A paper describes a structure:
In contrast, [name] does not activate G proteins and is intrinsically β-arrestin biased. One of the best described functions of [name] is “scavenging,” whereby it regulates extracellular concentrations of CXCL12 to shape chemokine gradients and maintain CXCR4 responsiveness by preventing overstimulation and down-regulation of the receptor. To address these questions, we used cryo–electron microscopy (cryo-EM) single-particle analysis to determine multiple unique structures of [name] bound to a series of agonists: wild-type CXCL12 (CXCL12WT), CXCL12LRHQ (a higher-affinity variant of CXCL12 with alterations at its N terminus), and the small-molecule agonist [name] (13, 14).
To eliminate any ambiguity, we also determined the 3.8-Å structure of [name]·[name]-CID24. In each of the three structures, [name] binds in the orthosteric pocket, with its core occupying a similar volume as the first few residues of CXCL12LRHQ. The 4-hydroxypiperidine ring of [name] projects deepest into the pocket, where its hydroxyl group is positioned to form a hydrogen bond with the side chain of H2696.52. The thiazole and homopiperazine rings of [name] effectively mimic the backbone interactions of L0 through H2 of the chemokine. However, its bicyclic aromatic ring occupies a distinct pocket bounded by the side chains of [name]-F1243.32, [name]-Q3017.39, and [name]-L3057.43. When compared to the chemokine-bound structures, several [name] side chains are rearranged in the [name] complex. For example, [name]-Q3017.39 is reoriented toward the entrance of the pocket and forms no hydrogen bonds with [name], and the H1213.29 side chain adopts two distinct conformers. Still, [name] recruits arrestin with almost equal efficacy as CXCL12 (14), consistent with the ready activation of [name] once its binding pocket is filled. [name] maintains selectivity for [name] over CXCR4 because the analogous contacting residues in the CXCR4 orthosteric pocket tend to be bulkier and would sterically occlude binding. For example, [name]-S2165.43 and [name]-L3057.43 are substituted by CXCR4-H2035.43 and CXCR4-F2927.43, respectively.
Residue numbers in the entry:
A (entry chain A): 40 to 186, 195 to 329
B (entry chain E): 2 to 213
C (entry chain F): 5 to 146, 151 to 230
The structure:
């Protein structure tokens, strides 16, 4: 068992390093490009910031995990980290959702809109997404305590609360984002197909990756969590093999999930020719 | 509407000289500017787009910059094919507003204007409208002052001035000022005159003719 | 990209017109189409713009409530309809494309008009066709004399003047037409020749007017 935890620790260290470097570079280039006459996008900067915060919080999780699931730090760290991580993760997911619809609208609706109006719209959307992410994340930390750091929900209906929270994490966390992103990237692909000039410059094998990496990142984790919750409901028989399999699956898929943090810079900005040229210039 | 002033209004630089044209906005526009080039009676082309990017196709001589809300177009060597007005556009705020333009013209040495006076043909007197013409030929630079004073009685408010474009060979202009009156009014007066003042003239030249 | 305009022509004041810019070589729906106007011998001006996809049109102040811009994607075309035209609308209209690129969505630049069509003169003049009247600017009394032909009261433009059956082409100037107050154009064409040659070789100027196919060979002589 300790072998698995050590392997996951190594993977986490690698992910932390890569994500930190990539997000820092992206943010720096985004800040500096505005002096060269470019028009950088607010969503990319906010997404980079959110990924940077999650990566910064990873080390606390690694330290807690290596310590045989013990929690040496106090309750203050419990609350602060479980709040920061959740807020940043939800913000990143919501920005990935909003970015697809913005990209699609850029080719049809915003073709003849002055830059000032679209800039104002983008700022409003960014503020709204940040506020919504914080509001959705707050309840989880609202009832988090340590004594083993975990959540102690109200007893009278404790059962419901569990599933309650889970539903949100699958309804507003992965279901709707995937639905919207897939639908709007398919529509964008169709719109590019309709035109002829755009075909030569752009490539249709990048949008498919955009819409598939989300699944590759967040489907195993959610299915594992749903299996765990169903097990906690005693629907599945209680067995040592089953509990061990669930534990291993949850840990490995959690480790895989954070790859979502370090794969955004490589997928949304690095492959962009203009960004690469600007980076080489800088 | 965002007002965009542009200077200098008119340039004069010989081939090979550098050129600099400045565009001043009113509010702050973030790098949303462009510079075109309208040849005489032709569709303008896009020279520079965004703050400083160069449209693919233009020679490397043309370049742009930015400083707060003041933009500038700089040309290293002014090739003979670069003589045409350049306009300044901003795209940040609708409605889009262009600039006045800064015509770039050939340069040469000062040359005096040849002045001539032409009365109206007796045949035109039948129509009842009499026109007299003062002609300035083969002069430089564009600036030139022409005035009418019939028997020392200054006339103003009724006259048409027309100038050509830089001559292909000599790079000189040519100006025509037409004075229009009525047959009775022309017959009433005794003598007519045309006075020309120019940079290449030490003193004004007054060419006068009598009605008979 | 081969944008081409159409339409245009003399229109009585207060009439109406419909200019059409028909694109090609690309889909119109992925870029906005603007209309630019240039008054005779003046700077450019903006008129209207349209996004063919969902039709979000923005107009200029001088044309607000008068000019309607529409798009047809089934033919890659845009149409500007103008009504209640005033005397100040005399100008030349171009249609421009504000190119948009998707392959740089994340890190883009403030685009600008790049492909312009040709002009289409729109003369809103209440006058009618007329034939030019040629008058001789004879040489002065008294080493190079000058003489010319003044063509007055003609409409519409243009007019071509050649001196002595095209024999003379050096020292001959034809000034641009000037719109008189009455609304009929005037134009002087003058050439300078040696003083001695006068009185020996007869000089004649050719005034040809295609709109009324009027040809006049005026014999200028002192
Ligand atoms: C390293 C690590 C990575 C995780 C990756 C994803 C989820 N959790 C991780 C986690 N833990 C476990 C789950 C609770 N989670 C709270 C939370 C709030 S919102 C949220 N998202 C759920 C998915 C949805 O798509 C977006 C929102 N998750 C954080 C704490 C981690 O630390 C392990 C603790 C030590 C041990 O495992 O013993
Ligand atoms: C308690 C804190 C650390 C967790 C709450 C999330 C933090 C990270 C959030 C809350 C409000 C957020 C800010 C809200 C708005 C903007 C403007 C944008 O143009 C750049 C990012 C920036 C400056 C955000 C940075 C991240 C931020 C500070
Ligand atoms: C994260 C999930 C659950 C919610 C995602 C909702 C996002 C995509 C919604 C929230 C507010 C919405 C914006 C509200 C207002 C406008 C202005 C309009 O002129 C264009 C569309 C636009 C820009 C909307 C795009 C979609 C939008 C950004």
């Amino acid at each position: 068992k300790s072998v698995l935890l050590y392997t996951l620790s190594f993977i986490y260290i690698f992910i932390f390093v890569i994500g930190m470097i990539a997000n820092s570079v992206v943010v720096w280039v985004n800040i500096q490009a505005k002096t060269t006459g470019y028009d950088t996008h607010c969503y990319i900067l906010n997404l980079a910031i959110a990924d940077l915060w999650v990566v910064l919080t990873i080390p606390v999780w690694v330290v807690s995990l290596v310590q045989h699931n013990q929690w040496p730090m106090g309750e203050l760290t419990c609350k602060v980290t479980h709040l920061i991580f959740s807020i940043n993760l939800f913000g990143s997911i919501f920005f990935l959702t909003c970015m697809s619809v913005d990209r699609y609208l850029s080719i049809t609706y915003f073709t003849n809109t002055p830059s000032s109006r679209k800039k104002m719209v983008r700022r409003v959307v960014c503020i709204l997404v940040w506020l919504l992410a914080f509001c959705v994340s707050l309840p989880d930390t609202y009832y988090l305590k340590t004594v083993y750091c975990r959540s102690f929900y109200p007893e009278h209906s404790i059962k419901e609360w569990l599933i309650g929270m889970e539903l949100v994490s699958v309804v507003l966390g992965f279901a709707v984002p995937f639905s919207i992103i897939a639908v709007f990237y398919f529509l964008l692909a169709r719109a590019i197909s309709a035109s002829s000039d755009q075909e030569k410059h752009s490539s249709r094998k990048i949008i498919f990756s955009y819409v598939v990496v989300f699944l590759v990142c967040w489907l195993p984790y959610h299915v594992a969590v749903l299996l765990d919750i169903f097990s906690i409901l005693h629907y599945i028989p209680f067995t040592c093999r089953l509990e061990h399999a669930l534990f291993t699956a949850l840990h490995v898929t959690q480790c895989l999930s954070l790859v979502h943090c370090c794969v955004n810079p490589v997928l949304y900005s690095f492959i962009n020719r203009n960004y690469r040229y600007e980076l080489m210039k800088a | 509407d965002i007002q965009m002033t542009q200077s200098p209004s008119s340039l004069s630089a010989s081939v090979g000289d550098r050129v600099t044209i400045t565009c001043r906005a009113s509010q702050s526009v973030s790098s949303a500017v462009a510079w075109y080039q309208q040849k005489p009676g032709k569709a303008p082309k896009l020279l520079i787009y965004s703050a400083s990017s160069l449209y693919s196709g233009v020679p490397s001589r043309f370049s742009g910059s930015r400083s707060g809300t003041d933009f500038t177009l700089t040309i290293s060597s002014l090739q003979p094919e670069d003589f045409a007005t350049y306009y300044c556009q901003q795209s940040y705020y609708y409605p889009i507003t262009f600039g006045q333009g800064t015509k770039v013209e050939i340069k040469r040495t000062v040359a005096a204007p040849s002045v001539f006076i032409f009365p109206p043909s007796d045949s035109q007197l039948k129509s009842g409208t009499a026109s007299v013409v003062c002609l300035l030929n083969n002069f430089y630079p564009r600036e030139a002052k022409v005035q009418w004073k019939v028997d020392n009685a200054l006339q103003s408010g009724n006259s048409q001035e027309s100038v050509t474009e830089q001559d292909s060979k000599d790079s000189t202009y040519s100006l025509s000022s037409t004075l229009t009156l009525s047959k009775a009014d022309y017959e009433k007066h005794k003598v007519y005159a045309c006075e020309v003042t120019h940079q290449g003239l030490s003193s004004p030249v007054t060419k006068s003719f009598n009605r008979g | 990209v081969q944008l081409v305009e159409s339409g245009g022509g003399l229109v009585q004041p207060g009439g109406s017109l419909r200019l059409s810019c028909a694109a090609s070589g690309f889909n119109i729906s992925s870029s906005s189409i603007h209309w630019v106007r240039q008054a005779p011998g003046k700077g450019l001006e903006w008129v209207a713009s349209i996004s063919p996809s969902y039709g979000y049109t923005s107009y200029a102040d001088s044309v607000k409530g008068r000019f309607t811009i529409s798009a047809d994607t089934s033919k890659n075309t845009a149409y500007l309809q103008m009504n209640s035209l005033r005397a100040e609308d005399t100008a030349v209209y171009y249609c421009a494309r504000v190119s948009y690129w998707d392959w740089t969505w994340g890190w883009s630049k403030y685009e600008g008009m790049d492909y312009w069509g040709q002009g289409t003169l729109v003369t809103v003049s209440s006058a009618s066709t007329k034939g030019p009247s040629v008058f001789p600017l004879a040489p002065s009394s008294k080493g190079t004399a000058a003489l010319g032909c003044l063509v007055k009261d003609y409409f519409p433009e243009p007019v071509t003047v050649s001196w002595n059956s095209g024999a003379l082409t050096s020292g001959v100037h034809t000034f641009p037409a000037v719109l008189q107050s009455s609304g009929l154009y005037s134009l002087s064409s003058v050439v300078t020749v040696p003083s001695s040659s006068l009185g020996t070789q007869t000089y004649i100027c050719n005034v040809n007017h295609k709109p009324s196919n009027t040809k006049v060979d005026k014999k200028v002589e002192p």
